[PDB]
Coordinates of C-alpha atoms in Angstrom, one line a residue:
Chain G
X1 CA 15.3 62.3 35.3
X2 CA 14.2 59.9 33.2
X3 CA 16.3 57.7 30.3
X4 CA 14.3 57.4 27.3
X5 CA 15.9 55.2 23.4
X6 CA 16.3 59.0 21.8
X7 CA 16.7 59.9 18.0
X8 CA 17.6 63.0 17.3
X9 CA 15.6 65.5 16.1
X10 CA 14.8 64.8 12.0
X11 CA 14.0 68.1 10.8
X12 CA 17.1 68.9 8.8
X13 CA 17.5 65.0 6.7
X14 CA 13.1 65.6 6.6
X15 CA 14.7 68.5 4.5
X16 CA 16.7 66.2 2.3
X17 CA 14.0 63.2 1.6
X18 CA 12.7 63.0 -1.7
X19 CA 10.9 60.6 -4.0
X20 CA 12.8 58.3 -6.6
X21 CA 11.3 56.0 -9.5
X22 CA 12.8 54.7 -11.7
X23 CA 10.1 52.5 -14.3
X24 CA 7.4 50.7 -11.7
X25 CA 9.7 51.4 -8.9
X26 CA 9.2 54.0 -6.7
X27 CA 12.0 54.4 -3.2
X28 CA 13.5 57.5 -1.3
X29 CA 16.2 59.6 -2.3
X30 CA 18.6 61.5 0.1
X31 CA 19.2 65.3 -2.0
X32 CA 22.9 67.4 -0.7
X33 CA 23.5 70.5 -2.6
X34 CA 22.5 69.4 -6.8
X35 CA 23.6 65.3 -5.6
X36 CA 20.4 63.0 -4.6
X37 CA 21.9 59.7 -3.7
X38 CA 19.3 56.5 -3.5
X39 CA 19.7 52.7 -3.8
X40 CA 21.2 51.0 -7.2
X41 CA 17.8 48.4 -7.1
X42 CA 15.7 51.8 -8.3
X43 CA 16.3 50.3 -11.8
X44 CA 15.1 47.1 -11.0
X45 CA 11.8 45.3 -11.1
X46 CA 10.7 42.4 -8.5
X47 CA 12.7 39.8 -11.3
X48 CA 15.7 41.5 -12.0
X49 CA 16.2 41.4 -8.1
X50 CA 16.7 37.6 -8.4
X51 CA 20.2 37.8 -10.2
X52 CA 20.6 41.6 -11.3
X53 CA 23.1 43.1 -13.4
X54 CA 23.6 46.4 -12.7
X55 CA 26.2 47.4 -14.7
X56 CA 24.2 46.1 -17.9
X57 CA 20.4 47.3 -16.2
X58 CA 22.0 50.4 -16.1
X59 CA 22.9 50.5 -19.7
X60 CA 19.1 50.6 -20.4
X61 CA 18.7 53.8 -18.4
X62 CA 19.1 57.8 -19.4
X63 CA 18.6 60.9 -17.0
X64 CA 15.0 61.3 -17.9
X65 CA 14.2 58.2 -16.8
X66 CA 14.8 58.9 -13.0
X67 CA 11.8 61.0 -12.1
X68 CA 12.9 62.7 -8.7
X69 CA 10.4 64.9 -6.8
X70 CA 10.9 66.9 -3.9
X71 CA 7.1 67.5 -2.5
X72 CA 5.5 68.3 -5.1
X73 CA 8.0 69.8 -7.5
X74 CA 10.0 68.1 -10.1
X75 CA 13.6 67.9 -10.1
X76 CA 15.5 68.0 -13.8
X77 CA 18.3 64.6 -13.7
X78 CA 21.5 66.5 -15.6
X79 CA 23.3 63.4 -15.2
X80 CA 23.3 60.0 -13.6
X81 CA 26.2 57.3 -11.9
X82 CA 26.5 54.2 -9.8
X83 CA 28.9 54.0 -7.2
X84 CA 29.1 50.7 -5.5
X85 CA 25.3 50.0 -4.8
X86 CA 24.5 53.7 -4.8
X87 CA 23.1 56.0 -7.8
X88 CA 23.9 59.4 -7.3
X89 CA 21.8 61.8 -9.6
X90 CA 23.2 65.0 -10.6
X91 CA 20.1 67.6 -10.0
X92 CA 20.3 71.0 -11.8
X93 CA 19.3 72.4 -8.4
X94 CA 21.2 72.4 -5.0
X95 CA 19.1 71.3 -1.8
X96 CA 18.2 75.1 -0.5
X97 CA 17.5 73.1 2.4
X98 CA 21.1 71.0 2.9
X99 CA 22.5 71.1 6.0
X100 CA 26.0 71.2 6.8
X101 CA 26.8 67.4 6.3
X102 CA 29.3 64.6 5.9
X103 CA 29.3 60.5 5.1
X104 CA 30.3 58.2 7.5
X105 CA 30.8 54.3 8.0
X106 CA 29.9 53.5 11.3
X107 CA 31.7 50.7 13.1
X108 CA 29.5 47.7 14.8
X109 CA 27.9 49.4 18.1
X110 CA 27.6 52.3 17.6
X111 CA 23.8 54.2 17.3
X112 CA 22.4 56.0 14.9
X113 CA 18.5 57.4 14.0
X114 CA 16.9 56.7 11.3
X115 CA 13.7 58.5 9.1
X116 CA 11.9 56.4 7.7
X117 CA 10.1 57.4 4.8
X118 CA 7.8 56.5 2.3
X119 CA 7.6 58.2 -1.0
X120 CA 10.0 61.0 0.1
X121 CA 7.5 61.5 2.6
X122 CA 9.0 60.8 6.2
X123 CA 6.9 58.4 8.6
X124 CA 9.1 58.7 12.1
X125 CA 12.2 58.3 13.5
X126 CA 13.8 56.1 15.3
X127 CA 17.2 55.1 17.3
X128 CA 18.8 52.0 16.3
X129 CA 22.3 50.6 16.1
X130 CA 24.6 49.1 13.8
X131 CA 24.6 45.1 15.1
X132 CA 27.7 43.6 15.7
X133 CA 26.8 41.4 13.0
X134 CA 26.1 44.5 10.2
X135 CA 22.5 44.2 10.6
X136 CA 20.1 46.5 12.1
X137 CA 16.9 45.7 13.7
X138 CA 14.9 48.8 12.1
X139 CA 11.1 49.4 11.1
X140 CA 11.1 49.0 7.5
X141 CA 7.9 48.1 4.9
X142 CA 7.9 48.2 1.1
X143 CA 9.1 51.3 -0.1
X144 CA 11.1 52.4 2.9
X145 CA 14.1 51.8 0.6
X146 CA 16.8 55.0 0.1
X147 CA 15.1 55.9 4.1
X148 CA 18.7 57.4 5.8
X149 CA 20.4 56.6 9.0
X150 CA 22.5 59.9 10.6
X151 CA 24.0 61.2 13.7
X152 CA 24.1 64.8 14.5
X153 CA 26.3 66.9 16.1
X154 CA 25.3 70.9 17.0
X155 CA 24.5 71.7 13.1
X156 CA 26.4 69.0 10.9
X157 CA 24.3 66.0 10.4
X158 CA 26.7 62.5 9.7
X159 CA 25.1 60.3 7.1
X160 CA 25.9 56.7 8.2
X161 CA 23.0 54.0 6.3
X162 CA 21.0 54.2 3.8
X163 CA 18.0 51.2 3.9
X164 CA 19.1 48.9 1.0
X165 CA 16.7 45.0 2.1
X166 CA 15.2 43.0 4.2
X167 CA 16.5 40.2 5.1
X168 CA 14.3 36.3 4.8
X169 CA 14.4 36.6 8.8
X170 CA 13.2 39.9 9.5
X171 CA 16.3 41.9 10.2
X172 CA 17.8 45.1 8.0
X173 CA 20.8 45.2 5.4
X174 CA 22.4 48.2 3.8
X175 CA 25.3 50.4 2.9
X176 CA 27.2 53.6 4.0
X177 CA 26.4 56.8 1.8
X178 CA 29.3 56.4 -0.7
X179 CA 27.6 52.5 -1.5
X180 CA 29.2 50.1 0.0
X181 CA 27.3 47.4 2.5
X182 CA 27.6 47.2 6.3
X183 CA 28.9 43.3 6.6
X184 CA 28.4 40.9 3.7
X185 CA 25.4 41.8 2.5
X186 CA 24.5 42.6 -1.0
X187 CA 21.8 43.3 -3.3
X188 CA 20.4 40.9 -4.5
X189 CA 17.3 38.3 -3.6
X190 CA 19.3 35.5 -2.4
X191 CA 19.8 33.4 0.8
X192 CA 22.7 36.5 3.2
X193 CA 21.7 34.6 6.6
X194 CA 22.6 36.8 9.3
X195 CA 25.7 35.4 11.9
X196 CA 25.7 35.3 15.7
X197 CA 23.2 38.5 17.1
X198 CA 25.7 39.6 20.0
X199 CA 24.9 42.0 22.7
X200 CA 27.2 45.2 22.6
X201 CA 29.0 44.3 25.7
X202 CA 30.5 48.1 25.9
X203 CA 26.2 49.7 25.3
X204 CA 25.1 47.4 27.9
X205 CA 27.5 49.2 30.6
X206 CA 27.0 52.6 29.5
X207 CA 23.5 51.8 30.2
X208 CA 23.5 50.5 33.5
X209 CA 25.5 53.9 34.4
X210 CA 22.5 55.8 32.8
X211 CA 20.5 53.8 35.1
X212 CA 22.0 54.8 38.5
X213 CA 22.2 58.2 37.6
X214 CA 18.5 57.9 37.5
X215 CA 17.6 55.9 40.7
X216 CA 17.7 52.3 39.2
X217 CA 20.3 50.9 41.4
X218 CA 19.0 47.3 42.8
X219 CA 21.3 45.5 40.8
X220 CA 24.8 47.3 42.4
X221 CA 26.7 44.7 44.4
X222 CA 29.3 43.7 46.5
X223 CA 31.7 42.5 43.8
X224 CA 34.2 43.5 41.4
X225 CA 35.6 41.1 38.5
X226 CA 39.0 41.6 35.8
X227 CA 38.6 41.8 32.2
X228 CA 39.4 38.4 32.0
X229 CA 37.3 37.0 34.1
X230 CA 34.5 39.0 32.4
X231 CA 35.1 37.9 29.7
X232 CA 34.8 34.4 30.4
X233 CA 31.2 35.3 31.2
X234 CA 31.0 37.3 27.9
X235 CA 31.8 34.5 25.9
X236 CA 29.4 32.2 27.4
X237 CA 26.4 35.0 26.9
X238 CA 27.2 35.4 23.9
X239 CA 28.1 39.2 24.4
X240 CA 31.4 41.4 22.9
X241 CA 34.4 40.8 24.2
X242 CA 35.4 43.7 26.5
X243 CA 38.9 45.4 25.9
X244 CA 40.5 48.2 27.9
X245 CA 39.7 50.8 24.6
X246 CA 36.2 49.7 26.2
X247 CA 37.0 50.5 29.7
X248 CA 38.2 54.1 28.9
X249 CA 35.8 55.3 26.8
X250 CA 33.6 54.2 29.8
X251 CA 36.1 56.3 32.4
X252 CA 33.6 59.7 32.5
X253 CA 31.0 57.5 33.8
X254 CA 32.0 55.9 36.2
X255 CA 34.1 59.3 37.6
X256 CA 30.5 60.7 37.4
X257 CA 29.0 57.5 39.5
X258 CA 31.7 56.8 41.2
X259 CA 31.6 53.2 40.4
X260 CA 34.3 51.5 39.4
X261 CA 34.2 50.1 35.5
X262 CA 35.1 46.2 37.1
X263 CA 32.6 46.6 39.5
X264 CA 29.8 47.3 37.0
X265 CA 31.2 44.4 35.1
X266 CA 30.9 42.4 38.7
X267 CA 27.1 44.2 39.0
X268 CA 26.8 42.9 35.0
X269 CA 28.2 39.3 35.6
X270 CA 25.8 38.5 38.3
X271 CA 22.4 39.9 35.7
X272 CA 23.8 37.4 32.9
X273 CA 24.6 35.0 35.8
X274 CA 21.2 35.6 37.4
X275 CA 19.1 37.1 35.1
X276 CA 16.7 40.1 36.0
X277 CA 14.4 37.8 38.7
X278 CA 11.2 39.7 37.5
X279 CA 12.3 43.2 38.0
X280 CA 12.9 46.2 35.5
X281 CA 16.1 49.1 35.2
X282 CA 14.8 51.8 33.2
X283 CA 11.8 50.1 32.3
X284 CA 13.2 47.2 30.9
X285 CA 13.2 43.5 31.5
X286 CA 16.4 43.0 29.6
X287 CA 20.0 44.2 29.5
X288 CA 19.8 47.5 26.6
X289 CA 22.7 47.5 24.6
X290 CA 21.5 49.8 22.0
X291 CA 23.1 53.3 23.7
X292 CA 26.6 54.3 23.5
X293 CA 28.4 55.2 26.3
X294 CA 28.3 59.0 24.3
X295 CA 24.3 58.6 23.9
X296 CA 24.4 58.3 27.5
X297 CA 26.4 61.5 28.4
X298 CA 24.8 63.4 26.2
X299 CA 21.2 62.3 27.6
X300 CA 22.1 62.6 30.9
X301 CA 23.5 66.3 30.4
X302 CA 21.3 67.4 28.2
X303 CA 23.7 68.5 24.4
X304 CA 21.5 70.2 21.1
Chain V
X1 CA 9.1 44.0 8.9
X2 CA 9.9 45.0 11.8
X3 CA 8.4 47.1 14.4
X4 CA 10.0 50.3 16.5
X5 CA 8.9 52.3 19.3
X6 CA 8.7 55.3 16.6
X7 CA 8.3 59.1 16.4
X8 CA 7.1 61.7 14.5
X9 CA 8.8 63.5 12.2
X10 CA 9.9 66.4 14.6
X11 CA 11.2 68.7 11.9
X12 CA 7.5 71.3 12.4
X13 CA 8.0 71.0 15.7
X14 CA 11.7 72.4 16.0
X15 CA 10.8 75.2 14.0
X16 CA 8.6 76.2 16.8
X17 CA 10.9 76.0 19.9
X18 CA 12.2 79.2 21.2
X19 CA 14.0 80.2 24.1
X20 CA 12.7 82.3 26.9
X21 CA 14.0 84.0 29.4
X22 CA 12.3 85.5 32.6
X23 CA 15.1 86.9 35.1
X24 CA 17.5 84.3 36.0
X25 CA 15.5 81.4 34.7
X26 CA 15.6 80.1 31.1
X27 CA 13.2 77.6 29.7
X28 CA 11.6 76.6 26.2
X29 CA 8.6 78.5 24.4
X30 CA 6.7 77.4 21.6
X31 CA 5.6 80.1 19.1
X32 CA 3.0 79.8 16.9
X33 CA 1.3 82.7 14.5
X34 CA 2.5 85.7 16.8
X35 CA 2.3 83.5 20.3
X36 CA 4.9 82.0 22.1
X37 CA 3.7 79.4 24.8
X38 CA 5.9 78.7 27.6
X39 CA 5.1 77.5 31.2
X40 CA 4.0 80.4 34.0
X41 CA 6.3 79.0 36.3
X42 CA 9.7 81.1 34.0
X43 CA 8.4 84.2 36.5
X44 CA 9.5 81.6 39.8
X45 CA 12.8 81.2 41.5
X46 CA 14.0 77.6 42.5
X47 CA 12.4 80.0 46.5
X48 CA 9.5 80.3 44.5
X49 CA 8.2 77.5 43.1
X50 CA 8.0 76.0 46.9
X51 CA 4.7 78.2 47.9
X52 CA 4.0 80.2 44.4
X53 CA 1.6 83.1 44.0
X54 CA 1.6 83.7 40.2
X55 CA -0.6 86.5 40.2
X56 CA 1.0 88.4 42.5
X57 CA 4.3 87.6 40.6
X58 CA 3.2 87.9 37.4
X59 CA 2.8 91.8 38.2
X60 CA 6.0 92.2 39.1
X61 CA 6.8 91.5 35.5
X62 CA 6.0 93.6 32.4
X63 CA 6.8 92.9 28.3
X64 CA 10.4 93.4 28.3
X65 CA 10.9 91.4 31.5
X66 CA 10.3 88.4 28.8
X67 CA 13.7 87.8 26.6
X68 CA 12.3 85.7 24.0
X69 CA 15.3 84.2 20.8
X70 CA 14.7 81.9 18.4
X71 CA 18.0 80.9 17.5
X72 CA 20.0 83.6 17.4
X73 CA 17.1 86.6 16.9
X74 CA 15.2 88.5 19.3
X75 CA 11.5 88.6 19.5
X76 CA 9.5 91.5 20.5
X77 CA 7.2 91.2 22.9
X78 CA 4.2 92.9 22.7
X79 CA 2.1 91.8 25.0
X80 CA 1.9 89.1 28.1
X81 CA -1.1 87.2 29.4
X82 CA -1.4 84.3 32.2
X83 CA -4.2 80.9 31.0
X84 CA -4.1 79.0 33.9
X85 CA -0.9 77.9 34.4
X86 CA 0.7 79.2 30.3
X87 CA 1.9 82.6 29.5
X88 CA 1.3 83.4 26.2
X89 CA 3.5 86.0 24.8
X90 CA 2.3 88.2 22.3
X91 CA 4.9 89.0 20.0
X92 CA 5.4 91.7 16.9
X93 CA 6.1 89.1 14.7
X94 CA 4.1 85.9 13.2
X95 CA 6.6 82.4 13.3
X96 CA 7.2 82.2 9.4
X97 CA 7.5 78.7 10.3
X98 CA 4.2 77.7 11.7
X99 CA 2.6 74.8 10.5
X100 CA -1.1 73.8 10.2
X101 CA -1.8 73.4 13.8
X102 CA -4.3 72.2 16.6
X103 CA -4.3 72.0 20.3
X104 CA -5.6 68.4 21.6
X105 CA -5.7 67.7 25.2
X106 CA -5.1 64.6 25.0
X107 CA -6.9 61.1 27.0
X108 CA -4.4 58.4 29.4
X109 CA -3.7 55.9 27.2
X110 CA -2.6 58.0 23.6
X111 CA 0.4 58.4 23.0
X112 CA 2.7 61.3 21.2
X113 CA 6.1 62.3 20.6
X114 CA 7.7 64.7 22.6
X115 CA 11.0 66.9 21.5
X116 CA 13.0 67.6 23.9
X117 CA 15.1 71.1 24.6
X118 CA 17.0 73.3 26.4
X119 CA 17.7 76.8 25.7
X120 CA 15.4 76.7 22.8
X121 CA 17.4 74.2 21.3
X122 CA 15.7 70.6 20.5
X123 CA 17.9 67.6 21.3
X124 CA 16.3 64.7 20.6
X125 CA 12.8 63.4 19.8
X126 CA 11.5 60.0 21.4
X127 CA 7.5 58.4 21.8
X128 CA 5.6 58.2 25.1
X129 CA 2.0 57.5 26.3
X130 CA 0.1 59.9 28.7
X131 CA -0.3 57.5 31.5
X132 CA -3.4 56.7 33.6
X133 CA -2.4 58.0 36.6
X134 CA -1.7 61.3 34.0
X135 CA 1.8 61.4 34.4
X136 CA 4.2 60.8 31.7
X137 CA 7.8 58.8 31.9
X138 CA 9.9 60.8 30.0
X139 CA 13.4 62.3 29.9
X140 CA 13.7 65.8 31.1
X141 CA 16.5 67.3 32.9
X142 CA 17.0 71.3 34.1
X143 CA 16.0 73.6 31.5
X144 CA 13.5 71.2 29.6
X145 CA 10.4 73.0 31.0
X146 CA 8.3 74.2 27.9
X147 CA 9.3 71.1 25.8
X148 CA 6.4 69.9 23.9
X149 CA 4.1 66.9 23.0
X150 CA 2.7 66.7 19.8
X151 CA 1.4 63.8 17.1
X152 CA 1.1 64.8 13.3
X153 CA -1.8 63.8 10.5
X154 CA -0.1 64.8 7.3
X155 CA 0.4 68.2 7.7
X156 CA -0.8 68.8 11.0
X157 CA 0.9 69.2 14.4
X158 CA -2.2 68.7 17.2
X159 CA 0.2 69.8 20.0
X160 CA -1.2 68.1 23.4
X161 CA 1.5 68.5 26.1
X162 CA 3.7 70.8 27.5
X163 CA 6.3 69.9 30.3
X164 CA 5.9 71.4 33.4
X165 CA 7.5 69.7 36.4
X166 CA 9.4 66.5 37.8
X167 CA 7.7 64.6 40.5
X168 CA 10.1 63.4 43.4
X169 CA 9.7 59.8 42.6
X170 CA 10.9 60.9 38.9
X171 CA 8.1 60.6 36.6
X172 CA 6.4 63.9 34.7
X173 CA 3.7 66.2 34.7
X174 CA 3.0 68.8 32.5
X175 CA -0.2 70.5 30.8
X176 CA -2.3 70.9 27.7
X177 CA -1.4 73.8 25.4
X178 CA -4.4 75.5 27.0
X179 CA -2.6 75.4 30.6
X180 CA -4.9 73.1 32.5
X181 CA -2.6 70.0 33.8
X182 CA -3.1 66.5 33.2
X183 CA -4.4 65.3 36.1
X184 CA -4.7 66.5 39.7
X185 CA -0.5 67.9 39.7
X186 CA 0.8 71.3 40.1
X187 CA 2.8 73.5 39.8
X188 CA 4.1 73.9 43.1
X189 CA 6.6 71.9 44.7
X190 CA 5.2 70.0 47.0
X191 CA 4.4 66.6 48.0
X192 CA 2.8 65.4 44.9
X193 CA 2.8 61.8 45.0
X194 CA 1.3 60.0 41.6
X195 CA -1.6 57.4 41.7
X196 CA -1.3 53.2 40.3
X197 CA 0.9 53.1 36.9
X198 CA -2.1 50.6 35.8
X199 CA -1.1 49.2 32.3
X200 CA -2.7 50.5 29.3
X201 CA -4.7 47.3 28.5
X202 CA -5.9 47.9 24.5
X203 CA -2.1 49.1 24.1
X204 CA -0.9 45.8 24.9
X205 CA -3.2 44.2 22.8
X206 CA -2.7 45.9 19.8
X207 CA 1.5 45.4 20.5
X208 CA 0.5 41.9 20.7
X209 CA -1.2 42.3 17.1
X210 CA 1.4 43.9 15.9
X211 CA 4.0 41.3 17.1
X212 CA 1.9 38.2 15.1
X213 CA 2.3 40.9 11.9
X214 CA 6.0 41.1 12.4
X215 CA 6.3 37.5 12.9
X216 CA 6.3 36.9 17.0
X217 CA 3.5 34.2 17.6
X218 CA 4.9 32.1 19.8
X219 CA 2.1 33.5 22.9
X220 CA -0.6 32.1 20.4
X221 CA -2.2 29.8 22.2
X222 CA -5.9 27.4 22.0
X223 CA -8.0 29.6 24.0
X224 CA -10.4 32.2 24.4
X225 CA -11.9 34.4 26.9
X226 CA -15.0 36.8 27.3
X227 CA -14.6 40.2 28.7
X228 CA -15.5 39.9 32.0
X229 CA -13.4 37.1 32.5
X230 CA -10.6 39.0 31.1
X231 CA -11.3 41.6 33.3
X232 CA -10.8 39.9 36.6
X233 CA -7.5 38.8 35.5
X234 CA -6.9 42.4 34.3
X235 CA -7.9 43.3 38.0
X236 CA -5.6 41.3 39.2
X237 CA -2.3 43.0 37.6
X238 CA -2.8 46.6 37.4
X239 CA -4.3 46.2 34.0
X240 CA -7.1 49.1 32.7
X241 CA -10.0 47.2 32.3
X242 CA -10.8 46.2 28.7
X243 CA -14.6 48.2 27.6
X244 CA -16.4 46.7 24.4
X245 CA -14.8 51.3 23.1
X246 CA -11.7 49.2 23.3
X247 CA -12.6 46.1 21.5
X248 CA -14.2 48.2 18.2
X249 CA -11.0 49.8 18.3
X250 CA -9.3 46.2 18.1
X251 CA -11.6 45.3 15.3
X252 CA -9.2 46.4 11.8
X253 CA -6.5 44.4 13.9
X254 CA -9.0 41.7 14.2
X255 CA -9.7 41.4 10.8
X256 CA -6.4 41.9 9.3
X257 CA -4.6 39.2 11.4
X258 CA -7.9 36.8 11.4
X259 CA -7.4 37.1 15.1
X260 CA -10.3 37.3 17.4
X261 CA -9.8 40.1 19.9
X262 CA -11.1 37.7 22.8
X263 CA -9.4 35.1 21.7
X264 CA -5.8 37.8 21.5
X265 CA -6.8 38.5 25.0
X266 CA -6.6 34.6 26.0
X267 CA -3.1 35.1 24.9
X268 CA -2.4 38.4 27.2
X269 CA -4.5 36.5 29.8
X270 CA -1.6 33.7 30.0
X271 CA 0.9 35.6 29.4
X272 CA 0.0 37.9 32.7
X273 CA -0.5 34.2 34.8
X274 CA 2.5 32.2 33.5
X275 CA 5.2 35.5 32.0
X276 CA 7.2 35.7 29.3
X277 CA 9.3 31.9 30.6
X278 CA 12.9 34.4 30.0
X279 CA 11.3 34.7 26.3
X280 CA 10.3 38.2 24.0
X281 CA 8.3 39.7 22.1
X282 CA 9.3 42.7 19.5
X283 CA 12.6 42.6 21.2
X284 CA 11.0 43.7 25.0
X285 CA 11.1 40.7 28.2
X286 CA 7.5 42.9 28.9
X287 CA 4.2 43.5 28.2
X288 CA 4.6 46.5 25.7
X289 CA 1.5 49.6 26.6
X290 CA 2.5 52.5 24.7
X291 CA 1.8 52.2 21.5
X292 CA -2.3 53.0 20.4
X293 CA -4.1 50.3 17.9
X294 CA -3.6 53.6 15.8
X295 CA -0.2 53.5 15.9
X296 CA 0.3 50.0 15.0
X297 CA -2.2 50.5 12.2
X298 CA 0.5 53.3 11.3
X299 CA 3.8 51.7 11.3
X300 CA 2.2 48.5 9.7
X301 CA 1.3 50.4 7.4
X302 CA 3.5 53.3 6.5
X303 CA 1.8 56.2 6.5
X304 CA 3.5 59.0 5.5

């Protein structure tokens, strides 16, 4: 029993973190096989970030300008290239701690763990979600760029995020491991505003199923709804429209608890319309949306 | 910017997790040097847990009855002993992945990370706190016993908790690594009820300082209070009495933000008396108490 915001064990990713310095800028790199991946803005000064021409700035850099250090040991850079917004630094040594891995580009609504690092050293791990506006709400200070987001399936790490910037509103933006930003964000210090931070409806429903499994059931009611009626309420409250695909994804949780998906939607509709009246669900006073249906099944069954 | 519930990187602890089986019971063990630590209730059946005589049950066990497996490799047990509620299984091989470590017994109010495991395999990591009633609010299913709680200071892991049981109310109880339970709990399936789950006042204040540092300041007001006046309100709301020691511990956060501790107490007093009026602080709709002042400084400064 119990339900917590859980991150994946970070060991496999800790073994991949290195420090990358170019000139006066130091950030984190990810060392997989004989390649180190890092944000291309490691080649920028704070001044360059205002309007950087990355191809032009990169012409002034040679392999020996990229200082890569794994713990106390220096890595030899034998090649460098820019792929979208990431630099790939080829080193002469394969990381002996390279886990089985994949690079995946996640969809909004999906969760992942972040290993926040500074100077190539891990500081902490936390679980977050790709928001529908393509930002993440992380905890990143100066020096955290290059920290990565990932999911694990038994022994394979799927890297999905690399941290690049903080918007003036305190939210975070980054790329996948191919260097493509999530959403419309760019690696330039400009007016970049985030869109509506809508609530991930399917994740809130999954978390309500987790609450029922773990004993919190006060919000269950005598009502039902339809997908279209629920979506009229979802629109009003800036929740993502629920689709038949979301209903199908919630099938296993519905089967386990015996609560039909649309009945849980009616519970959620009442919670949106009436609030929680000073009560809590799984220790929260708001509707939590950063647990996917897969996260709920995984945590409730103890997948290793 | 940003403030998240962050756990320590779990790699150093992942390298210590093993599976321990005795008869039909399988749980987790912690392998440090040539000793494996695990809950003594690994020697019990579900029936034995009702009224176990551990010394008597242990007489029927020999070294070869304790099956210890680290990944796919079996460990040879050359001795066993019971220390309070933990068993220490001496093995013939020192764990090559033994980090620098200490065993510490934490005080209520202190936080730690838990690496939840099943069959000696890590499933997830999350941050929690020793509650004032000596329970923890974790996420533990059957098979999670022997999962540990820890803190890290640079390269030294301080182990503080080992999971042993779940009370009928869904909260968790366990021991330090010397086998002494936190609080009055016992390793017997009996009516064990938890006391009042009071709120850790000093941690709520530290989290309000984190909120100010990270931009959330709507709750700051024109008022001040005294330790005695604040404590009249703390008593009414089941909050721990604030002491001069707590005020002194908050000194660095007070110096950083320029907000006197007693002024923050007056903000907290207003929040307790009037609620949050549908507003949030650091993405929470309730007053968070599982970040210590040290956690706030650590996260806000990026300690690795």
